[PDB]
Design an enzyme around this catalytic site. Sequence first.
Site, PDB file in Angstrom:
ATOM      1  CD  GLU A  51      -6.423  -2.523  20.675  1.00 50.12           C
ATOM      2  OE1 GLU A  51      -7.447  -3.131  20.305  1.00 50.12           O
ATOM      3  OE2 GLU A  51      -6.034  -2.514  21.860  1.00 50.12           O
ATOM      4  CG  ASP A  89     -11.442  -2.943  20.103  1.00 41.99           C
ATOM      5  OD1 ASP A  89     -11.892  -3.347  21.192  1.00 41.99           O
ATOM      6  OD2 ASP A  89     -11.130  -3.709  19.172  1.00 41.99           O
ATOM      7  CE  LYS A 115     -15.050  -9.640  13.959  1.00 41.03           C
ATOM      8  NZ  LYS A 115     -15.630  -9.818  15.319  1.00 41.03           N
ATOM      9  CG  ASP A1160      22.198   4.169 -31.937  1.00 41.80           C
ATOM     10  OD1 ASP A1160      22.409   5.375 -32.161  1.00 41.80           O
ATOM     11  OD2 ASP A1160      22.085   3.331 -32.852  1.00 41.80           O
TER      12      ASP A1160
HETATM   13 MG   LIG Z   1      22.917   4.827 -34.025  1.00 45.45          MG
END
Ligand SMILES: [Mg+2]
Length: 1785
Positions: A51, A89, A115, A1160
Site C-alpha cells: 500500500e 488506505d 473485492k 558455418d
Molecule cells: Mg558452409
Amino acid sequence: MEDDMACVKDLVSKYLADNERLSRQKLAFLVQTEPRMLLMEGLKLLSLCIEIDSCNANGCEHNSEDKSVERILHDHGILTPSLCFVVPDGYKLTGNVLILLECFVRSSPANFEQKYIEDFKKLEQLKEDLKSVDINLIPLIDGRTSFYNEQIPDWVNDKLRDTLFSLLRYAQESNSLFEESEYSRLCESLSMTSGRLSGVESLNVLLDNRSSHYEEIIASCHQGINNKLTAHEVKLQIEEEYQVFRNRLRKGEITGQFLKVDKSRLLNDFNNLYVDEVTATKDNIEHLIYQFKRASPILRFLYANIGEGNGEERHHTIKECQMQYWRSFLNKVKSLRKLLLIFDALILLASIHDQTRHKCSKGWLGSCFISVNDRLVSLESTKRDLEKWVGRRQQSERSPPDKNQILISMFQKTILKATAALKDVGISVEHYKINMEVICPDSYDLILNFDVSGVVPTISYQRTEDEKFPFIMGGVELLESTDLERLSSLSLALVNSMKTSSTVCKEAYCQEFLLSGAEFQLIYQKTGECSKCYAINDNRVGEICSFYADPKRYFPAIFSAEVLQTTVSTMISWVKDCSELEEQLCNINSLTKMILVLILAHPSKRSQKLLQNLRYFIMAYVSDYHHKDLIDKLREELITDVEFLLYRLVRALVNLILSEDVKSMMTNRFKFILNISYMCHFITKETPDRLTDQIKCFEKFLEPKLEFGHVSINPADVATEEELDDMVYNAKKFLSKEGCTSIKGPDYKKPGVSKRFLSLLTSSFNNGSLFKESEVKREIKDPLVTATALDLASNKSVVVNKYTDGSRVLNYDFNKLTALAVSQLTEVFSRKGKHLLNKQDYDYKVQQAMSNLVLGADLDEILLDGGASVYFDQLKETVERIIDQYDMGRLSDDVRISERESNSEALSKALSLTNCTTAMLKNLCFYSQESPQSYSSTGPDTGRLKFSLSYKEQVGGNRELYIGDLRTKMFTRLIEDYFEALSLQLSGSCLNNEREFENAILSMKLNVSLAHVSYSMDHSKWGPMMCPFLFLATLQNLIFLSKDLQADIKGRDYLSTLLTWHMHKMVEIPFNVVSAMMKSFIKAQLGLKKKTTQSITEDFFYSNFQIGVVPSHVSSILDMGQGILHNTSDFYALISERFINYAISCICGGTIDAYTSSDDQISLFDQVLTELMQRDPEEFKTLIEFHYYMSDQLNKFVSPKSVIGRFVAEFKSRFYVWGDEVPLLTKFVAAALHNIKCKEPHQLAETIDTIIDQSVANGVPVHLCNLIQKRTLSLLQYARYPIDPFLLNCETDVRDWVDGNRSYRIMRQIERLIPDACGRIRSMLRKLYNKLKTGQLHEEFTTNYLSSEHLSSLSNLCELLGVEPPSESDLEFSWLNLAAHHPLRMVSSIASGFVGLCRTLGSKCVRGPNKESLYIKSIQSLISDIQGIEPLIDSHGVQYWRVPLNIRDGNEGVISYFRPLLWDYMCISLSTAIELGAWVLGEPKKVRVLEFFKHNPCDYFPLKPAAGLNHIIHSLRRLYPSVFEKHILPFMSDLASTKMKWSPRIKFLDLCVALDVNCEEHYIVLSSELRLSHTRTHSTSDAVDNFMRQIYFESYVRSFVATTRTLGSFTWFPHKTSVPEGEGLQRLGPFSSFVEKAIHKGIERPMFKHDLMPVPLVVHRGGLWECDKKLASFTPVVQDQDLEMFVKEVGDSSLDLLIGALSAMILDRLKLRMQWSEVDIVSMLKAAMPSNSVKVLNAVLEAVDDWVDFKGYALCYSKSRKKVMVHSSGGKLRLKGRTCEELVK
Ligand SMILES: [Mg+2]
Ligand SMILES: [Zn+2]
C-alpha cells in the site's frame, strides 16, 4: 524450523530499506515467537509495503495512523453529519473534490473482481450521503496482482514467502486456527510466481565458500591482458603486425597454404587418386558394361536370361489349387492358441488331388515342400513318423481297427474344433474356398503310396561353386526397365524374411516369390534380424546364387519401379541441347543407370562416403582459390571388389562431362554433377554394427586430450591438491601462444590464444568501434531482465545416479570386472571353440582349462611355461574368491555404475518434493528438499557436474552426444538463456532468428548477380578445441553497461561461478568399451591373437590395467559440450568475425560483410576488393593469408574445404548461381522413399503430404509427386487395408499445391469421384455463405443441423434457402469408416516398423459398439452378406458404397459405420471457404487450348501464394472462461486486473469460434506447368480508435482519475508492442505526449497539466477537467452498431443511467455543432431495444430540447401535447417553425 525464522529475521533486519514508516510493523514482527503471531505480523508487513508503494505511485499521501474519513474531514475543518465507519488506505483533497484509495492482491480472476465490486459499492454507499454537503467523491481502486514490492530485493521476497508457506503447514495448528476458505485463499497467495527476473540471483541464498583457488584462477585469467587501449593504438599494433607478417612471408619462411585452381591439374589429381590397385589410366565403356553385368552374384542374377521357357504355365497362376486355400486356412487357425504331421499329410493329399486333376507343379522343390509355417518339409521322415504314430495309436487301442480308418477319423475332430474356434468373433467359414473331398477313402495308404523325385538343393557357404552359372550371363539391356522389378521382388522377399518367429536337413526356412510367370524360392536357416547367408532356388535348376546380405538396409527399392526410371529420365533431360555433347548422349544414358543400380544392390557406408566427397571436388573445380590440402581429404579407404568399379564408373562419367572440349552450358553441367553427388542419401542413415561404432567415438574424444597432455583419471568428489595444481598450471599454459614476432614463428593447428590479440579484441569492443549506428542509439539493456521446464521434456534420456551410503559411487570395481569378462569369453567360446584343430595344439588347452575352472596335470606346465605363470595364479585366486560371494545376474549390474531413465519420469519424481505443483525452473533447483545449501568454486555441495557419452547417427560421419542428469540440465539452461538474450541484441547471427536468414539469402542473391567475390567458410574441430575457460577469460574483461557500474559487477560474478562449475566436469566412460578393453587385455596377456596394431588408445588402458585401478571418469580443460554450449559459442564467433573484418578493412581499402550460425559462415566482399583481385594477384593472396593467420590466432581454424570464387555461393546447403536455380531433386526423393512409421494410417498420409508439399516448392515436377503418392497407396494396399477417399489424392496439379491445402485437395478428389451431384450443393452453398456473411439465420444449423441427425439436414437447408434439394438417388453414397466409436488399438528402424504395421493390421484392432474386439475380415463378411449394397471401385483403388435408405434402418448393427458422403463434403467445403478465401466456391474452369511447344526444362518462375488476435482473445475470455484461464493466462499473460467492458463485437467470428469448439516464403515452379491447370471464379488505426472509444464510453458512465495505472489497466492499448515512433500519434489529441514521455519510458506517475502543451487531472465525460474547470476534450466518431452495443451494455438493468447518458451525449455534441445525419435513431432503438424503445425515446427527447438530423428524418418534442413530432411535409402542426406529424396514433 527455528533456523528458518532466525535467518528470515536476519534478512528482514538487514535488507529492509531505512524508512521510519516501516519501523512500527518492523518491531512488532521482529519480536514474536508463536507461529500464528509471526504469520499475521508478516502478512501485515507485506501488505503495508504494497500500500505504501501504491500510494506513492499514484500521488496520495499515506493514511498511516488509520484515521476515519469522518475524522479526516473534521480535523481538516469541515462539517460532517454522520457516516458509516470506513477505513481508507490513502486519500487526497483538491478544492471541492476528493480522492480515496484501496488496494489488495488477488491472483485469480475469479476471486479477483469480487473485492473490486465490494469496494466500489462500499464507496458509493458513502458518496450518496456526502452529496448533501457540496463535495464530490471519486472512488479510486487499485488491484495489483503480485506481492513483488519495491522497497525489497525480490529474492528476499520469495525467500520470505516460501518459509511462511512452509511454516503455515502445521496440520493441527492450521485446523484449530481457521476454516478451509481463508486457508485456501492464503496457500494460493504464496504461489511462487515466476516474478520479473531470471532466477540466477537466487544464488544469494547460499553460503559463499570461495577460497584462494578461485582467486588464483581469476587473477591468472586477468594478468597480462589490457582492456583499455584507445581507438588510436589499435591501428598501430595492426599495421606493425601486418608489416612484419608480409615481410617475413616474402622471404619464403612461412608456408603458403593456398593454391590457384588449374583445371587440368585438378582433373589429373582426381584421375589417378587410387593409383595403386586401379591399374589403368583410361577405361572403355564396352569393357565397363561387360564386367558390370557379371561382378556380383546379385548383379549377375539380375541381368541373366531367365523366363524364356514360358508357355501356358505363365498363365496358370490364377487357376489356384486347393492346397493354397488349405495352407492359408491352416496358417490363420494356427495363431489361435504331432499335429504338424496332420498338417503335412493334409497339404500333401491336397497337392495329390491337385496333381491328379491338373498336374499343377506348385509348392514342390525337388524332394521337399513348404507346409504351413514357411518351413520346408522333407518326405521320408514324415511318412516314417506317421506310420510309427498310427502304429502306436492302434497298439494303445488294442491294449479290428485298421490304420486307414484311424487316419480318416482323426481329421474330423480337429476340423470341427477349428470350425468352432474361429467362430468366436465374426468371420465365417464359407469364404475360404476349401473342398471337403480331401478325406479320400484310402487316405493312409495313398499317403504311404506316394514318392517324388527331383534335385535336392542346399546352401553353399564355401567358394568355387559360384563360377558355373546356369543361365546366360547378360540378356537384359539397360534402356529398358526390367531389372528394377526383379530388384523390387527380391527386396520384398528379403524384408519379409524378418517375419518368422522362433518356431521351436534338420531345419530350414523358405520364402517364395514370382517373377514374370516363373517362381523361385529364397531359403535361409536362422530367424531374427542379423546378417546371414541366403540361397536362391528353383524347381528346374539348383542354387542359382548365394550371398551374404542383411535383412534390413533393403527397404527403398520396394514398389519403386517407375519412380527411379522417371528420376533418371528427367535428370538426363537437363543436358540434351549441348551440341558438343550430343553424339555421346546414349553413353551418358547408360552410365547413370548403372551407378544407381549398384548403389541399391550393395549398400555400404564406404560407398556413401565416396559418393559424398564429390561435392567438394566439383565445388573446387569452379572456384578461383582453394586449400592446398584438399585432395588428400578425399582418399579415405576402400576394401572390396565392388567399390572400385563404382570409382571407375564415376571417374569415366566425370571425364566425359567435364572434358576440355565444351563451352556451351556450364550451369546445367554443374547442376547435373551436383545431383549425382547427392545420390548418397539413397542408402541409409543407420549403423552397420553398433559395438564397433561405439569405439570410434571414444577415439575421437580422447586423442586431442593427450597431445595437450592434460588428463586426470578417476577424479574424486572432493577435489584434492594435485588436481587443482595441475588445473591452474594448464590454464596458465593455454594462454601462452605466440607468433610472427618470435624465432620459431607461428605453428598452425594448435589450441590456444595469444594475449596480444585477446587484449586487442576486448579493448576494441570496449570502444564502441564494433557497433553499427542503429545498434549504438539503442543502449544495451542488461540481460538479467526477461521460464517453463516442459521444454526439457523432449523425450531425451536422463542419467540417474547410484548410492550405496551417504555417498555416491564413481568407480568401476576392478576385481568384480575380470570375473564377468572371463565368464563372458567362456560363454562365447564353449559353444564355438570346438571347431578347430582341438586336443591340445596350442590354444584349446588353455581355454578349456579356464572354462572348466568357472563352470560349476601336464596342461599346467604346457600353459605356464611361456611366463604366463603368476598372472594365471592370481587370476584363479580372485575368480574363485569372488564367485563364492554368490550367477551372471548379480554381477551383471553391480559393476554398472549408472543407468538411464526417461525425461518425464524424473520430472515427476522431482515435482513430488516441492510446494508449487507446476513447472517452474527457479522453484525446482533452489527451493526444495533436495537442494544444496553451500557451494565452493567446483560446483554445489551435492557433487560436481556429471555427463555420459553416446553417439548419434548421420549421413556421412557421426556425431557425439553428452547426456547429463537433472541438476546439470537445470544449471545449464540459465547460462544458455543469458547468452541467447545477450546475442539477440546484435545483428548477424542466424542460429535462432529467421529474418536474419532471409536477409542472408537476399544478400547472397544480390552479390552473385554482379560477379562479386564470395567466400564460403567452414571451421573444423569446432567441438573439441573450445573450452569454458576461454569464455570465462573473455567475459571478465567485458563491460556492457558503461553508464552504471553497480549491477554488471553483481551480474558477472554469478556467471563466473557457473562457468567455473562447468570447468570441472566429469565425463563417464561407457560400459561396453571398458568390457571389451578388459577382454582384449586378458586375451593378450597369455598370447592368443593377432597382436599387430596396439594403437594409441590401448596402451592408455593397459598401463592402468596392469597396475590395478580402472579408468572410470575423465576430467580436463580442453573440451566444451559438443552440442551443449551452443549459444555462447555462437556469441563468441560473432564477436570474433566482426573484429577480424574490422581489422582487414583497416589494413586495405575495402569492406566485408559476414553471416554465421555456429561454425558455418559466408563472407561477401566489395567492389574494391573484386577490382584488386585482377590487378595484383600477389597482394590479394597475401591478404587472404593474413586473414588465415589472424583467424588462427583466436582459436578459430579453417577447414580445407573452404573456397573463394565468383560463380557460386553456399550457406547451410543452399546453393545459388546467376539467373538459373539449383534444385536438389535427389535429396527430397530419397527422403520421401523411406519415411514411413507405425501409426494410424491416417497420419502417414499427412506426413507424406507435408513432405511432398515441401519438395514441390523447390523444383520437383508434379508427375513424380503423383507417382510417389501412388507408391505409398500401393504399400498400404499390400497390407490389405480398405482405402477411403480421405487418405491421399494422386491427381494433383500445380495450383493444388501452390494455393490450396490438405482439405482443398480432398474436396477436389471428392468432386472428381461423383460429379453432377456436387453442382447443386455448391450452388446452395453460395447463397448460404452470402446470407451468413450478413448474419440472417446464424443460429439454427450450428445448434441443430450441425448437431442433430444429419439425415434431413440438407433438405431443411435447401428449403430454407428455397432451392431444389438433392435428388433421392444421391443420398445412398457412403464410405466405410472404421474407428467410428473408438480409435484402433496399436500398442527403432524403418523395416521393422513396416513389418510391425503389417502384423498389427491383421489382428483384433477395431472397437465394437461399446467394448469388444473384432477383425477386419469379419466386417467384410457382414457387409457382404446383405444383398442390397453395391460397392464401387475407382481406377486407382478408392472404394465407396451405395446403400438405400429404405434399409437404412432395421439392421442397425453393421450400418453403425457407414456415413453419408455429401454431408462430409459440405462440412469440409464450408470450413475450407472460411479458412482460405471465398473464391473456392466458384466452378472449376479448366483450360486446354494450347499448342505444343519446346519446353526448356531449365525455365522457372517464382510465385507467392494468396493468403485481429485481440478479438480472438476477447471472444475466448467472453465466452469460454474455464478453458481460457487455464490455457492462456499461464502460457503468457497476466491480465487479471484488466478491463474489457467496452469493445466491439463480431457475429461471424463469434459463430466461427462456436463451431470450432463445437464442430512458404516462395514457390519455384516450371512455366511448362503453370500453363496447364484449373481456375475458380469469384489496421493499427483500428486499435487506436478502439482505445479512444473505450475511454470515451467509460468517461460518461462515471468519473475516474488520469494516471499511469488507470489508463494502462484497460485492454485496447499499444503496450510497447512492435510500434514505430509515429504510427497513431495524430489520433491522440490531448493524449499524445503522455504515453511517450511517461508510459513509453517506464515512469509510474500521475499526469499533470504540464503534460498537454499542483493538482492532478480528472477524466470527466469527454473532456478533461481539473477542480471545477475544463481544459480540453476529445471525441472520436460513433456508429449505429457501436451505439447498439452501448445501449445494450448500459441499459440492461437501470434506465435513468441510459437516459442521462444519452441526453448528455446529445447535448454536448450539439453545442459543438457536430452532425448526427450519419445514423438513425428510431430504427436503431428498435433494433437495439426490441421491446421498450418508445418510453426511452420520449424520455431522451424530452430531456434535450432541440432538433437533430438523422438517417433520413428529424424529430422533436412537443409540450402542449406530451408526445413527439416528426418533421414531415404532410404534417400541419407547428413546432419550432417546422411542420410535423405524429409517430404512432
Ligand atoms: Mg558452409
Ligand atoms: Zn492350378
